[PDB]
Design an enzyme around this catalytic site. Structure first.
Site, PDB file in Angstrom:
ATOM      1  N   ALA A 114       0.703  -1.209  -0.197  1.00  0.00           N
ATOM      2  CA  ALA A 114      -0.652  -0.057  -0.069  1.00  0.00           C
ATOM      3  C   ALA A 114       0.888   1.140  -0.283  1.00  0.00           C
ATOM      4  CB  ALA A 114      -0.616  -0.332   1.301  1.00  0.00           C
ATOM      5  N   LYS A 163      12.453   0.925 -22.331  1.00  0.00           N
ATOM      6  CA  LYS A 163      12.631  -1.018 -22.097  1.00  0.00           C
ATOM      7  C   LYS A 163      12.156  -0.809 -23.711  1.00  0.00           C
ATOM      8  CE  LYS A 163       7.179  -0.754 -21.650  1.00  0.00           C
ATOM      9  NZ  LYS A 163       5.827  -1.121 -20.737  1.00  0.00           N
ATOM     10  N   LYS A 219      -2.410   8.392 -34.153  1.00  0.00           N
ATOM     11  CA  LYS A 219      -2.389   7.771 -32.387  1.00  0.00           C
ATOM     12  C   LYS A 219      -4.024   8.698 -32.205  1.00  0.00           C
ATOM     13  CE  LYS A 219      -0.957   7.521 -27.440  1.00  0.00           C
ATOM     14  N   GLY A 221      17.534  27.302 -48.937  1.00  0.00           N
ATOM     15  CA  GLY A 221      17.292  26.536 -50.108  1.00  0.00           C
ATOM     16  C   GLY A 221      17.830  25.077 -49.359  1.00  0.00           C
ATOM     17  N   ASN A 271       9.044  -0.104 -25.990  1.00  0.00           N
ATOM     18  CA  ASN A 271       8.541   1.174 -26.493  1.00  0.00           C
ATOM     19  C   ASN A 271       9.285   1.565 -27.571  1.00  0.00           C
ATOM     20  OD1 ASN A 271       6.698   1.426 -24.429  1.00  0.00           O
ATOM     21  ND2 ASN A 271       7.278   2.021 -22.949  1.00  0.00           N
ATOM     22  N   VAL A 303      -3.843   3.319 -32.511  1.00  0.00           N
ATOM     23  CA  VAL A 303      -3.807   3.997 -32.944  1.00  0.00           C
ATOM     24  C   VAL A 303      -3.728   3.050 -34.907  1.00  0.00           C
ATOM     25  CG1 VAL A 303      -0.495   3.490 -34.003  1.00  0.00           C
ATOM     26  CG2 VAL A 303      -1.627   3.671 -32.368  1.00  0.00           C
ATOM     27  N   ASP A 313       9.813   5.151 -18.692  1.00  0.00           N
ATOM     28  CA  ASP A 313       9.309   4.202 -18.692  1.00  0.00           C
ATOM     29  C   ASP A 313      10.328   3.725 -19.760  1.00  0.00           C
ATOM     30  OD1 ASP A 313       7.412   1.879 -19.237  1.00  0.00           O
ATOM     31  OD2 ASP A 313       6.009   2.890 -20.665  1.00  0.00           O
ATOM     32  N   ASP A 315       6.850   6.129 -26.951  1.00  0.00           N
ATOM     33  CA  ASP A 315       6.198   5.852 -26.332  1.00  0.00           C
ATOM     34  C   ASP A 315       6.091   7.570 -25.249  1.00  0.00           C
ATOM     35  OD1 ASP A 315       3.158   5.519 -24.135  1.00  0.00           O
ATOM     36  OD2 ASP A 315       3.781   3.820 -25.026  1.00  0.00           O
ATOM     37  N   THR A 345       7.040   0.758 -15.742  1.00  0.00           N
ATOM     38  CA  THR A 345       7.033  -0.355 -15.737  1.00  0.00           C
ATOM     39  C   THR A 345       7.597  -0.986 -14.265  1.00  0.00           C
ATOM     40  OG1 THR A 345       6.650  -0.455 -17.933  1.00  0.00           O
ATOM     41  CG2 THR A 345       6.771  -2.606 -17.355  1.00  0.00           C
TER      42      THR A 345
HETATM   43  O1  LIG Z   1       6.489  -2.137 -39.164  1.00  0.00           O
HETATM   44  C1  LIG Z   1       5.471  -1.933 -38.973  1.00  0.00           C
HETATM   45  C2  LIG Z   1       5.359  -2.639 -40.509  1.00  0.00           C
HETATM   46  N1  LIG Z   1       5.696  -2.657 -41.421  1.00  0.00           N
HETATM   47  C3  LIG Z   1       4.763  -2.652 -42.899  1.00  0.00           C
HETATM   48  C4  LIG Z   1       3.419  -2.176 -42.503  1.00  0.00           C
HETATM   49  S1  LIG Z   1       3.702  -1.292 -41.251  1.00  0.00           S
HETATM   50  N2  LIG Z   1       4.932  -1.256 -37.980  1.00  0.00           N
HETATM   51  C5  LIG Z   1       5.320  -1.289 -36.696  1.00  0.00           C
HETATM   52  C6  LIG Z   1       3.891  -0.533 -35.828  1.00  0.00           C
HETATM   53  C7  LIG Z   1       3.891   0.450 -36.741  1.00  0.00           C
HETATM   54  N3  LIG Z   1       4.404   1.347 -36.908  1.00  0.00           N
HETATM   55  C8  LIG Z   1       4.242   2.604 -36.237  1.00  0.00           C
HETATM   56  N4  LIG Z   1       4.779   4.428 -36.693  1.00  0.00           N
HETATM   57  C9  LIG Z   1       4.841   5.048 -35.194  1.00  0.00           C
HETATM   58  C10 LIG Z   1       4.354   4.525 -34.301  1.00  0.00           C
HETATM   59  C11 LIG Z   1       3.726   3.629 -34.618  1.00  0.00           C
HETATM   60  N5  LIG Z   1       2.248   3.212 -32.507  1.00  0.00           N
HETATM   61  C12 LIG Z   1       3.056   2.626 -32.766  1.00  0.00           C
HETATM   62  C13 LIG Z   1       2.157   2.006 -31.024  1.00  0.00           C
HETATM   63  C14 LIG Z   1       1.706   1.441 -30.465  1.00  0.00           C
HETATM   64  C15 LIG Z   1       0.351   1.348 -29.678  1.00  0.00           C
HETATM   65  C16 LIG Z   1       2.014   1.329 -29.085  1.00  0.00           C
HETATM   66  N6  LIG Z   1       2.001   3.317 -31.018  1.00  0.00           N
HETATM   67  C17 LIG Z   1       2.661   3.888 -32.266  1.00  0.00           C
HETATM   68  C18 LIG Z   1       2.780   5.560 -31.990  1.00  0.00           C
HETATM   69  C19 LIG Z   1       1.984   6.391 -32.864  1.00  0.00           C
HETATM   70  C20 LIG Z   1       0.959   8.093 -33.202  1.00  0.00           C
HETATM   71  C21 LIG Z   1       1.581   8.687 -31.567  1.00  0.00           C
HETATM   72  C22 LIG Z   1       2.432   7.494 -30.718  1.00  0.00           C
HETATM   73  C23 LIG Z   1       2.834   6.795 -30.863  1.00  0.00           C
HETATM   74  N7  LIG Z   1       3.573   2.283 -35.176  1.00  0.00           N
HETATM   75  C24 LIG Z   1       3.395   0.124 -38.665  1.00  0.00           C
END
Ligand SMILES: O=C(c1nccs1)N1CC[C@@H](Nc2nccc(-n3cc(C4CC4)nc3-c3ccccc3)n2)C1
Length: 779
Positions: A92, A628, A532, A447, A631, A517, A626, A644, A661
């Site tokens: 607690a 890890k 997001k 430029g 992320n 997302v 955070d 994140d 975490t």
């Molecule tokens: O590797 C891929 C892909 N390969 C081929 C086509 S898409 N991806 C990995 C995750 C995706 N890419 C991506 N790029 C930027 C941000 C995020 N993302 C993912 C997450 C998960 C929920 C925790 N969060 C974000 C994110 C997006 C916008 C703002 C902040 C975080 N994802 C797609």
């Protein structure tokens, strides 16, 4: 939950006996077993009384059993009886816990809630730090310390308490500790004779931080006395060597006040300071005299006082931190005309010709000034910032001059450009579709897009006046210096971040994570983004109104290759939106899955990448909190992206809220006496251990959040039999130093100590940031 518990309360004046037994329980407790008898007492007096306890519901109360017996049924059936002296609900005090299990009574509890507990630790900690910091500002030896350095050594302060008649220091002893009296009164004795009485704000042991000599007095507490103490041992870990840092600070401050040395890099001024000849002179002594001066060109006074003359005429008195010789540094072949004579015993820094050439990287001062003031400008630009030092040096020497006169179109809207320009002298108007956008002046640039793209210029650039000079480099020279991967990176990044995007121009292809997302296409350009979506209603309902404001602020200003780049935000009736680059190389966890245990080079690459991302955030006083692998994504080239920024905070002194975490949380977060950027360097250690060893080093196989926290606080750090590399084990041990003060990376030099660790001996930090290394894994 706690509402029920308040019913049972009764106002019971704690007798001497009760301030004893509570002291025991807390002393033998996970979070409290390292608090002074002062803090344990303050906590002890906040303990409410309860006549008469828990179930399986959310609970904020920690209890110390006083009177009766209390059965603890773990899974709806008796587990163990507990009696006078026992405690429970330890969890607690850390965090909002799903209770261990029900605890009925058989036949008095002491109690306190988490909110009251964390708040008391916070107020005690902040009060103690702020007092120690104000006191350090009253100790003259620390005067030439920077604000940052003063805050660092404030953490190094250890409280000590002294009973009436108790010796603090004995004459003849070899102490390395300085004491500041916080409360009370000590007598000073020399050869057993009563000299004087120290009071609140008094201090002694300055010499004990600098020299290894015996105490010159015996100092005995007259009444109960509390001191702040700094040990030379801890001071040396945190600062390296006090006298060296003081003299360096004096010299760098002086060089930063000079109109010549002003315009040089922080690294160059530290070289000058560290390379300067430091000499003592007697009083009334000719140090420099007209024609009889050779290679000396500049002096800074570190101690005492000197008088500057020109023939017979006194020009002034130079004391600590004052300096002379601008015109000699500019004109190193011209005869020395001035005289400098000491007014007292003094210590002077001499900068010579050799010192100037070695530190400023050239025999010729005006070439050095020119080089650096081109370097300063491109070094603040994203597209040039992460180029190697070799590539940077090639680009700077590629710059040529051209001249323009009032009304000259330097660039014409609609034309295909090949040139990047920097303004040496004058003012230009930027004009887009007949509308003046802004005026640019000396040291501004324009430029740069012509370097990455063959496209029509979007604006004219018109010379505002006569005698306008620009540096310029053609893209052919840039394209020769740069290599495939970095160029692909920049071409991808700049195009997608500068595209004007409206919500109506986006369509969704798939969901990425689940608010949600989405993977989105911009219809006009065919460029892919991540979007997001956070529920407006969900934010109002979780009082997260201030927190999302601060997430946008941090996510917005991030401009690093190894951190996610925000394009813009949107808002409608139902949602806040973040539009970012789409990262397409998958997750870091996908990579360590395919790869298994990392080799030294693969570990160097992923940790080093993270170090550069975290170093960037710390430089802007952000703590990530955070860190890890979860992320971290990979881009299509196999280079990492931190994504994140939910847990990230701008650092306003000391942070106290428990966030992150559990497996990756630093001990100083858990213990609640305050933390800063250091917590990210602990997490760095947890990440390295994962990488090389495989499992997490603390609470690897524990479900219960409490047992994870115990292992982080007190567990033995061990390595598997297949991890033997001395340099790997040493970096991991130093990163997972429980006390942040002696953790690696967490001292004056910052991330330099991590970068320079033998674990990274064969590792090229320039090539990493420059995308010139082969990554552990691609696609
Ligand atoms: O590797 C891929 C892909 N390969 C081929 C086509 S898409 N991806 C990995 C995750 C995706 N890419 C991506 N790029 C930027 C941000 C995020 N993302 C993912 C997450 C998960 C929920 C925790 N969060 C974000 C994110 C997006 C916008 C703002 C902040 C975080 N994802 C797609």
């Amino acid at each position: 939950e706690d509402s029920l518990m308040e019913d049972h309360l009764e106002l019971r004046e704690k007798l001497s006996e009760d301030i004893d037994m509570i002291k025991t329980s807390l002393k033998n407790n996970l979070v409290c077993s390292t608090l002074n008898d002062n803090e344990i007492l303050t906590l002890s007096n906040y303990m409410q009384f309860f006549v008469f306890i828990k179930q399986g519901e959310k609970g904020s109360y920690f209890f110390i059993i006083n009177s009766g017996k209390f059965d603890v049924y773990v899974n709806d059936k008796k587990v163990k009886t507990m009696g006078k002296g026992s405690s429970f609900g330890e969890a607690a005090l850390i965090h909002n816990t799903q209770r261990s299990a029900t605890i009925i009574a058989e036949t008095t509890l002491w109690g306190v809630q988490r909110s009251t507990f964390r708040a008391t630790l916070k107020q005690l900690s902040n009060r103690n730090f702020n007092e120690n910091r104000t006191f350090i500002d009253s100790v003259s030896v620390f005067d030439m310390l920077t604000e940052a350095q003063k805050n660092m050594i404030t953490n190094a302060c250890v409280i000590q308490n002294f009973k009436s008649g108790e010796t603090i220091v004995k004459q003849g002893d070899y102490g390395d500790v300085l004491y500041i009296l916080k409360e009370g009164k000590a007598t000073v004795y020399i050869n057993d004779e009563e000299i004087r009485v120290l009071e609140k704000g008094s201090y002694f042991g300055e010499r004990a931080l600098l020299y290894d000599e015996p105490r010159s007095a015996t100092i005995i507490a007259k009444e109960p006395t509390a001191c702040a103490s700094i040990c030379r041992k801890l001071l040396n870990i945190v600062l390296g060597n006090l006298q060296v840092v003081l003299f360096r600070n004096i010299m760098t401050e002086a060089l930063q006040q000079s109109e010549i040395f002003k315009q040089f890099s922080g690294d160059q001024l530290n070289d000058l300071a560290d390379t300067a000849i430091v000499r003592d002179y007697p009083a009334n002594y000719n140090i420099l005299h007209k024609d009889k001066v050779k290679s000396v060109k500049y002096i800074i006074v570190l101690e005492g006082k000197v008088e500057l003359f020109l023939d017979d005429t006194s020009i002034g008195i130079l004391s600590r931190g004052m300096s002379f010789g601008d015109q000699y540094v500019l004109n190193q072949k011209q005869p020395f005309k001035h005289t400098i004579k000491s007014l007292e015993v003094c210590k002077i820094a001499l900068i010579t010709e050799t010192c100037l050439a070695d530190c400023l990287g050239n025999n010729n001062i005006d070439a050095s000034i020119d080089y650096n003031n081109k370097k300063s400008i491109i070094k603040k630009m994203y597209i040039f910032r992460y180029l190697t030092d070799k590539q940077c040096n090639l680009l700077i020497e590629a710059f040529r001059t051209t001249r323009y006169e009032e009304g000259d179109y330097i660039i014409q809207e609609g034309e295909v450009g090949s040139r990047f320009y920097i303004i040496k002298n004058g003012e230009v108007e930027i004009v887009k579709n007949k509308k003046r956008l802004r005026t640019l002046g000396k040291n501004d640039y324009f430029g740069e897009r012509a370097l990455l793209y063959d496209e029509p210029r979007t604006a004219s650039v018109i010379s505002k006046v006569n005698n306008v000079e620009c540096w310029f480099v053609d893209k052919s020279v840039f394209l020769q210096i740069i290599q495939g991967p970095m160029l692909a990176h920049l071409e991808e990044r700049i195009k997608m971040q500068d595209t004007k995007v409206e919500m109506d121009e986006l369509e969704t292809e798939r969901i990425i994570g689940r608010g949600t997302v989405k993977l989105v296409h911009h219809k006009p350009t065919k460029i892919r983004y991540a979007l997001k979506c956070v529920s407006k209603r969900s934010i109002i309902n979780l009082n997260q109104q201030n927190n999302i404001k601060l997430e946008r602020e941090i996510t917005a200003e991030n401009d690093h290759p190894f951190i996610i780049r925000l394009v813009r935000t949107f808002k409608d009736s139902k949602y806040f939106y973040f539009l970012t680059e789409l990262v397409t190389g998958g997750e870091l966890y996908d990579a360590i899955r395919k790869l298994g245990l990392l080799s030294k080079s693969q570990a160097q690459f992923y940790l080093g990448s993270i170090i550069l991302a975290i170093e960037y955030l710390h430089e802007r006083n952000i703590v990530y909190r955070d860190l890890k692998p979860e992320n971290i994504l990979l881009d299509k080239q196999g280079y990492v992206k931190l994504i994140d920024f939910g847990c990230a905070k701008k650092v306003q002194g000391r942070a106290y809220t428990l966030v992150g975490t559990p497996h990756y949380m630093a001990p100083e977060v858990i213990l609640g006496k305050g933390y800063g950027c250091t917590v990210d360097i602990w997490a760095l250690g947890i990440c390295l251990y994962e990488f090389i060893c495989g499992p997490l080093p603390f609470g690897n196989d524990e479900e219960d959040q409490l047992e994870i926290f115990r292992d982080i606080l007190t567990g033995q750090l061990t390595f598997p039999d297949y991890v033997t590399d001395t340099d790997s084990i040493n970096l991991m041990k130093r990163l997972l130093c429980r006390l942040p003060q002696g953790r690696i990376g967490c001292s004056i030099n910052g991330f330099k100590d991590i970068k320079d660790h033998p674990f990274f001996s064969n590792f090229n930090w320039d090539k990493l940031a420059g995308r010139l290394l082969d990554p552990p894994l691609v696609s």
